[PDB]
């Protein structure tokens, strides 16, 4: 209840604690997780990726081979609407974010869908999102947050946004190479000390100085209050954490509650991805199937990312990311694809979102 962490302003919104729960697809950070996180006073973030899978394709107009047909159904507006409404049944009008990656067919469509669903903040990575305000202009109060890997990207994004829209980002998330999901670094760079989050954050904060000290949120490998305090002492205004929340009871992908307490460090690895960035996965499910010669058949149905070119890169790397993550959300241990931060092996007990926030904020 008593904390020395101070509330964080992002645009017109305020969160009690300077903590983001990072967005996680597919079906990992939806209404239960984000709702309870926001209820606790942190920023709950709803992933807008693969919402067609929500409640086993409850809100898709067409299904092929048990998959949402095309990007209009993979990124389902009605599903997103219901997820946000259900989250607000828990967290009321407490701020909620919507996370949507840049490298998609229909980026503006999904951003505006998130705004119309009630998002207070849009968070976008997996690319250089130089045009978020173009699609946000009808929603003046929604804060816009790019995820970056470098101070150079901060400078570029601010200059482009300022020149074109007379607006700059409301915050920046700098994500390091210990994070879950995809990495904003080449595989070889993920292991180099120059790109450790403790080295990225000071550079991004110094670059931020020139544009009015836009708040900086450090993400990737942050485990406990000590890591939070380190990042804050390096100039960050807040932190974004995901793996800790991946190990909470309120996680919307229930499989993780059984997978994480058994997870060993040697079973976490960086793999190739149809998205075109290294992805940090657990060596289980579809990965194992690929190595046995029983890889699921690949034929693009959901058209989930532009860099893949409708199955070309999926066939090259050996798996479809939409199919695998959807199967994971639907409970497929044999063929699901499972992601984790580097810290995933440190999850022993599955605890409540409430006790996690208490651990992170007490004192
Ligand atoms: C399971 C999992 C799924 C993720 N999916 C996404 C995603 O869809 N979009 C995104 O921007 N980041 C994604 N990430 C990255 C997180 O939002 C977060 O920035 C990162 O994991 C923070 O590091 P930590 O996990 O050590 O706290 C994912 C991370 C994990 C662990
Ligand atoms: C449908 O495709 C899917 C399925 C699951 C997850 C995703 C996804 O978008 N995964 C992510 N993982 N980390 C992300 S990050 O934006 O925080 N870092 C980052 C990473 C790379 C580059 C830059 C600039 C920043 S995005 C997409
Ligand atoms: S084949 Fe490629 S573009 Fe199509 S759903 Fe799979 S990963 Fe996405």
């Amino acid at each position: 209840m008593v904390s020395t962490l101070k509330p964080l302003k992002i645009g017109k919104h305020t969160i009690k604690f300077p903590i983001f729960q990072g967005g996680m697809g597919v079906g990992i950070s939806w209404d239960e997780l984000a709702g309870n996180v926001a209820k606790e006073g942190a920023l709950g973030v709803i992933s807008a990726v693969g919402t067609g899978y929500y409640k086993n394709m409850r809100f898709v107009e067409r299904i092929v081979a048990k998959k949402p047909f095309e990007a209009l159904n993979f990124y389902s507006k009605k599903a997103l609407n219901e997820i946000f409404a259900n989250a607000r049944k828990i967290c009321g009008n407490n701020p909620l974010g919507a996370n949507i990656l840049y490298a998609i067919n229909d980026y503006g469509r999904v951003l505006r869908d998130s705004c119309e669903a009630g998002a207070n903040i849009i968070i976008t990575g997996a690319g250089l999102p130089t045009n978020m305000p173009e699609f946000a202009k009808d929603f003046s109060d929604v804060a816009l947050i790019p995820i970056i890997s470098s101070a150079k990207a901060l400078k570029i994004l601010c200059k482009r946004w300022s020149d074109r829209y007379k607006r700059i980002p409301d915050a920046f998330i700098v994500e390091g190479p210990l994070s879950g999901g995809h990495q904003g670094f080449k595989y070889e760079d993920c292991f180099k000390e120059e790109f450790r989050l403790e080295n990225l954050v000071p550079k991004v904060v110094e670059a931020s100085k020139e544009w009015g000290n836009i708040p900086i949120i450090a993400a990737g490998g942050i485990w406990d209050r000590k890591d939070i305090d380190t990042m804050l002492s390096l100039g960050a205004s807040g932190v974004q954490m995901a793996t800790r929340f991946l190990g909470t009871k309120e996680c919307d992908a229930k499989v993780y509650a059984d997978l994480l307490p058994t997870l060993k460090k040697e079973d976490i690895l960086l793999i190739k991805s149809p998205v075109g960035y290294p992805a940090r996965a657990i060596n289980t499910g579809v990965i194992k199937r690929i190595e046995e010669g029983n890889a699921p058949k690949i034929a693009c149905v959901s058209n989930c990312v532009a860099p893949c070119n409708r199955g070309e890169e999926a066939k090259k790397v050996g798996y479809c990311i939409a199919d695998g993550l959807g199967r994971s959300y639907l409970g497929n241990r044999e063929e699901g694809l499972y992601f984790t931060g580097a810290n995933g092996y440190r999850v022993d007990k599955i605890i409540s979102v409430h006790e996690l926030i208490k651990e992170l904020t007490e004192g």
Side-chain angles (χ1 to χ4, degrees):
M1 303 209 135
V2 187
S3 170
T4 50
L5 300 171
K6 312 175 160 184
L8 180 51
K9 289 185 82 235
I10 307 279
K12 285 136 183 233
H13 313 287
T14 302
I15 49 173
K16 190 164 145 50
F17 303 114
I19 298 173
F20 293 4
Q21 156 261 302
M24 295 180 284
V26 163
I28 297 169
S29 64
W30 279 345
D31 41 291
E32 193 180 6
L33 187 62
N36 278 281
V37 170
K39 169 182 190 159
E40 302 296 338
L43 183 58
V45 176
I46 287 170
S47 162
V49 186
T51 50
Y53 277 99
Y54 172 71
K55 296 314 182 180
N56 205 357
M57 273 139 277
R58 166 173 301 176
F59 300 111
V60 300
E61 299 175 16
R62 188 182 174 191
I63 299 170
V64 173
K66 295 157 89 183
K67 308 152 183 184
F69 174 75
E70 265 282 1
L72 202 81
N73 288 307
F74 189 69
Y75 305 103
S76 153
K77 178 178 168 300
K78 282 189 189 290
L80 190 57
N81 286 344
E82 178 150 306
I83 295 166
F84 260 93
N86 287 350
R88 299 217 175 270
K89 286 164 165 179
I90 306 163
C91 73
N93 289 315
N94 287 21
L96 282 177
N99 178 298
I100 171 62
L101 73 150
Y102 193 61
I104 67 159
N105 207 45
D106 315 350
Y107 172 75
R109 181 181 77 74
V110 179
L111 192 148
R112 306 197 57 265
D113 283 348
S114 300
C115 293
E116 294 178 351
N120 308 109
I121 293 175
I122 309 289
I123 296 164
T124 286
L128 194 70
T130 59
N131 65 334
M132 297 177 79
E134 172 85 12
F135 317 111
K137 42 199 196 185
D138 285 342
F139 312 92
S140 61
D141 287 3
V142 177
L144 306 175
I145 306 187
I147 312 189
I148 53 175
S149 308
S150 75
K152 176 177 153 165
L154 177 142
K155 305 194 174 195
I156 289 193
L157 281 164
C158 296
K159 191 199 167 200
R160 306 250 179 108
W161 281 38
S162 195
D163 291 349
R164 192 168 314 128
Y165 315 111
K166 293 164 180 165
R167 181 185 181 172
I168 56 155
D170 298 288
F172 281 101
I173 293 159
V174 50
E175 199 198 48
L178 298 184
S179 73
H182 296 87
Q183 317 298 309
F185 306 90
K186 285 153 271 313
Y187 166 84
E188 192 198 337
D189 287 344
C190 282
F191 303 96
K192 302 220 267 234
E193 315 93 279
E194 310 77 89
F195 304 111
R196 283 178 63 80
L197 188 62
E198 297 97 319
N199 294 324
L200 310 168
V201 168
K203 296 180 195 343
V204 176
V205 169
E206 175 62 25
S208 203
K209 270 184 58 143
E210 183 185 0
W211 310 81
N213 300 297
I214 305 164
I216 305 303
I217 311 306
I222 302 174
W223 184 252
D224 49 24
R225 176 58 174 279
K226 289 209 294 203
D227 297 347
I228 292 177
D229 287 342
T230 295
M231 293 311 152
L232 294 192
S233 82
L234 295 172
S237 293
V239 301
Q240 171 168 278
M241 298 163 73
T243 293
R244 285 310 297 270
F245 298 100
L246 191 61
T248 63
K249 313 181 179 300
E250 288 87 356
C251 185
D252 292 272
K254 299 301 169 184
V255 56
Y256 282 92
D258 290 304
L259 180 54
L260 287 185
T262 80
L263 179 50
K264 305 179 102 163
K265 183 171 181 181
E266 69 259 28
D267 285 330
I268 304 179
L269 80 169
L270 293 166
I271 56 154
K272 296 184 141 171
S273 184
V275 184
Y277 305 94
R280 188 170 264 105
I282 303 167
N283 200 19
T284 196
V286 62
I287 308 298
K288 288 296 188 178
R289 301 293 86 72
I290 292 159
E291 279 153 26
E292 302 159 346
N294 301 301
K297 301 171 165 201
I298 290 174
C300 176
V301 168
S302 320
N303 192 18
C304 74
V305 293
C308 181
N309 186 28
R310 301 188 145 286
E312 169 180 14
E313 306 304 335
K315 288 167 174 80
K316 278 179 218 168
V317 307
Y319 69 91
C320 157
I321 188 164
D323 293 353
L325 296 179
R327 285 165 174 142
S328 285
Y329 166 75
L330 297 176
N332 196 334
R333 282 289 288 261
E334 292 78 17
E335 292 175 324
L337 173 71
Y338 303 94
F339 286 171
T340 182
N343 279 332
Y345 68 98
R346 296 167 77 176
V347 178
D348 181 27
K349 306 183 162 164
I350 301 300
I351 67 174
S352 81
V353 155
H354 179 77
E355 301 298 312
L356 173 59
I357 299 293
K358 195 212 171 232
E359 188 206 305
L360 299 179
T361 58
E362 193 158 21

